[PDB]
Design a protein around this nucleic acid. Structure first.
Ligand SMILES: Nc1ncnc2c1ncn2[C@@H]1O[C@H](COP(=O)(O)OP(=O)(O)NP(=O)(O)O)[C@@H](O)[C@H]1O
Ligand SMILES: Nc1ncnc2c1ncn2[C@@H]1O[C@H](COP(=O)(O)OP(=O)(O)NP(=O)(O)O)[C@@H](O)[C@H]1O
Ligand SMILES: [Mg+2]
Ligand SMILES: [Mg+2]
Lengths: 228, 228, 114, 114, 114, 114
DNA sequence: ACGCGCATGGATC
DNA sequence: GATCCATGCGCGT
């Protein structure tokens, strides 16, 4: 029965992606939960912590007060729950009041995990989509035909997500490059070979849960990867 | 195979002069499973069989034959093989939500399980009533309209129904009394169609049966509607 | 009046409930021995020797069995004069040219659209 | 495979390794659950046993009372739950109230064994 | 099989002019499971069994016999196989709700439990 | 697998093992549910039977009466709950009121089983 | 006194 | 974990 935390998780992320978008606002509407757009993960905690403290009035509408003043919780004012400096005004406990205490406490544990510092660190704010992709295939200031990923002495928990993200990121780079070239009636001009050295670690025969998310990352490259 | 039922799309591997026809009726009424490794010509063969089906015309005309083939093409490859075909993508195809029967209406919209019996009931009763309101045929077909009937209903007014019933107020006689522009009325089968609009104000002394217990239901329902 | 054409890359990864109802079977090159044993048992014992040619099949060579065909035989499918838009990428030929500018701005803009 | 029992174990041991570190603050931040630093298992049991008895107020915050006075359970005051002499003060049941009792009884079953 | 026990509805595949009777009393009291792929002929085989059961009349009378066969038709096939039969669709069949034996009355009306 | 019967059985037994323990106090805190020392099981009956007579007052406390005096449900005062001659005093039902009678009846059945 | 409102709790899946 | 439901306590006429 995790559908309200799952709902408020995407609702926080989708909203935070739209506020942190500074471009064409026809594109701002098609930003959604899976869109590769920047959002502040700490502001997502600010949203869910507030939603845990929310209090509806007699009319069943949640009311909030910040430094600006009292306001209604709707789609046009849900972005003001991204700060701690809000106080809930209401007569009864809200829809998600008290239902997200262990949800926040588990989710902050992922953020302050030093294992996951390469993903949830403070350095994720500065980098953009272009810099990440040029880093993976050596397209930056220094250019290389070979990019090596030094994951020698690394634990399996952060080895698996290194493998699954980059195998997906390279695949979707290869996929989206082909559709760009098909508009100009050309073929893909970047063929990428991913070398999986000692592949017994992340793609084994067994069907364990920690082996799962890195298997279909390599399976999808094995199945439909050579077209892209 | 008789002369008319022959369907040729291949020749013998050892003898290219020997044509291999299959029974075209028995080829297609019993389902086809085509398997092979990557690069084995599987997609070309599927296109080749479909092309031979398209030009399989009896003598006497020039236009299109009675072939009807639907392709679930996940690689954008079959457009080139059939240039005179209709190609549909998600951005252009419209499969209406009111064409769902009972099973997929709950699967698409409801993520709750095993403890949602009041939430299931207000979902079907909103949809069935809204299907009856927008019906424009004879009244004999109107009363057999049920939850799985493929009839048009407005999901926005369905949300308006559960949002209104989220604020329902019963009186001393345990009946729900509402007010709108027409006047005061009681929630029953002949007046519950007035709950599909948001300018209805509840009037009562005590909270109703669904007062405050559908706030997370509408939030999950509005998320699936607004999901792009 | 509604039938299906199952195109899949391995016989041993699709559900049997859909797969068993397919009487017409087309089998191309299958290098996995688990797949060749699946094609083995779909055949009678008298025509059980032809599946040994499965991993040696070239492109466009297929094994067709069912009530549609007289005998299960290895056939060469007719070449598509109007082919699907699935052209194999020449890795050595693409890699031999110079480093490409590769237009990163358009790729991640379309990526963000999806 | 209880993730609430898993999360309360890591957040106890990670915090307990912080309070017993006597060193440079920059190294203290990188201390996590797998890092090889000393923590006392008796206080870890006490932290989990206390978190079996959390009682939130109407503002959804857990409130306790040791000998030095009432305090609110947050990041700065979570080290006060390592001592046994804390009494919960609240109205409703806490976030982890009653979800960790089978965790605690097995936790001291292995500590107390000679 | 005894001469009064024989119930024939099929002939041998290798030899047509030999019938293959089954023990008719043992055929129907012990439950019948008929299986085969799609379009194999299960419905025609079922229809032929029930047709030979209907005309299985002992000598000495005219009129229909004591056979009682109930068919659950979900593809509407057996109406033409048995023209002198009673067909009951949902729109005309009436099963009273007060015939429920309590357990189904418990489950028909409450979608909730416990 | 009733959870709420499991807890009260250990608070009966682990506390009983502390009362009857005659050693030095230092190993009384290591006393657990799995520690092999003497506890009186008829007093374990009297604890669970009395906890089924729990009475909760206005300020959410359980108050009993005894020959020595009147006391509340504190850990020091829970040791005198092992006698059958106590009578509860309160306003409403307790936390474990009315859900341990089948647990007592099963425990009495085992001990009085020959 | 009773009614309504809110809060706590626990029963399940 | 959420939904649903019940019991209870507090503040209003
Ligand atoms: N009948 C044929 N004769 C000769 N070459 C063929 C024939 N059919 C296909 N090919 C070649 O085989 C190549 C691979 O075919 P393709 O359309 O990718 O099938 P495929 O095995 O399903 N690929 P994939 O979907 O990734 O498994 C084509 O690009 C053609 O060059
Ligand atoms: N004894 C028979 N001799 C010849 N053909 C037969 C015989 N029995 C059935 N058929 C043929 O079987 C086909 C119909 O199959 P059917 O009786 O519907 O089997 P089925 O298994 O019930 N089909 P399905 O419901 O999809 O599984 C027709 O083409 C009939 O001619
Ligand atoms: Mg293909
Ligand atoms: Mg049939």
């Amino acid at each position: 029965n995790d559908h309200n935390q799952r709902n408020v998780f995407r609702q926080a992320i989708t909203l935070n992606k739209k506020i942190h978008f500074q471009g064409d606002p026809a594109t701002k509407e098609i930003i959604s939960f899976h869109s590769p757009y920047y959002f502040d993960i700490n502001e997502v905690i600010n949203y869910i912590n507030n939603r845990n403290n929310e209090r509806k009035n007699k009319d069943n509408e949640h009311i909030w007060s910040d430094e600006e003043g009292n306001f209604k919780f709707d789609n046009e004012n849900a972005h003001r729950l991204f700060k701690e400096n809000v106080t809930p005004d209401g007569s009864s406990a809200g829809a998600l009041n008290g239902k997200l205490l262990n949800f926040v406490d588990r989710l902050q544990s992922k953020i302050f995990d030093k294992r996951l510092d390469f993903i949830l660190g403070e350095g994720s704010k500065s980098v953009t989509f272009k810099e990440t992709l040029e880093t993976l295939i050596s397209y930056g200031k220094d250019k290389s035909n070979i990019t090596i990923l030094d994951v020698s002495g690394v634990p399996f928990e952060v080895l698996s997500i290194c493998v699954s993200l980059i195998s997906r990121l390279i695949f979707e780079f290869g996929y989206h490059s082909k559709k760009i070239k098909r508009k100009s009636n050309e073929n893909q001009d970047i063929p990428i070979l991913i070398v999986y050295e000692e592949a017994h670690k992340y793609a084994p025969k067994s069907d364990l849960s920690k082996y799962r998310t890195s298997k279909e990352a390599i399976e999808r490259i094995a199945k439909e990867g050579r077209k892209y | 195979i008789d002369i008319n039922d022959r369907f040729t799309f291949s020749s013998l591997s050892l003898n290219t002069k020997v044509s291999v026809p299959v029974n075209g009726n028995r080829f297609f009424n019993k389902h086809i499973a085509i398997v092979g490794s990557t690069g084995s010509g599987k997609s070309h063969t599927v296109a080749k069989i479909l092309q031979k089906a398209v030009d399989e015309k009896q003598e006497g005309y020039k236009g299109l034959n009675n072939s009807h083939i639907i392709i679930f093409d996940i690689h954008s490859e079959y457009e080139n093989a059939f240039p005179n075909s209709n190609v549909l993508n998600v951005d252009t195809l419209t499969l209406p939500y009111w064409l769902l029967n009972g099973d997929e209406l709950e699967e698409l919209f409801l993520d709750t399980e095993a403890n949602d019996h009041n939430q299931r009931n207000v979902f079907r009763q909103a949809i069935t009533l809204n299907k009856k309101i927008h019906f424009q045929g004879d009244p004999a077909t109107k009363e057999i309209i049920s939850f799985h009937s493929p009839y048009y209903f407005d999901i926005n007014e369905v949300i308006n129904y559960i949002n209104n019933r989220n604020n329902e107020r019963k009186n001393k006689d345990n009946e729900h009394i509402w007010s709108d522009e027409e006047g005061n009325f009681k929630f029953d089968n002949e007046n519950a169609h007035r709950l599909f609009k948001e300018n209805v104000t509840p009037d009562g002394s005590s909270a109703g049966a669904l007062n405050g217990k559908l706030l997370n239901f509408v939030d999950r329902l509005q998320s699936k509607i607004f999901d792009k | 009046g509604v039938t299906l054409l199952l195109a899949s890359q391995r016989p041993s990864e699709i559900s049997e409930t859909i797969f068993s109802q397919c009487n017409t079977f087309i089998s191309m090159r299958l290098t996995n021995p688990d797949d060749q044993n699946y094609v083995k048992r779909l055949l009678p014992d008298t025509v059980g020797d032809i599946t040994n040619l499965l991993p040696s099949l070239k492109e466009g060579e297929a094994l067709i069995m069912g009530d549609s065909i007289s005998i299960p035989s290895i056939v060469k499918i007719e070449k598509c004069t109007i082919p699907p838009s699935s052209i194999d990428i020449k890795y050595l030929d693409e890699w031999r040219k110079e480093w490409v500018d590769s237009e990163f701005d358009k790729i991640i803009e379309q990526w963000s659209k999806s």
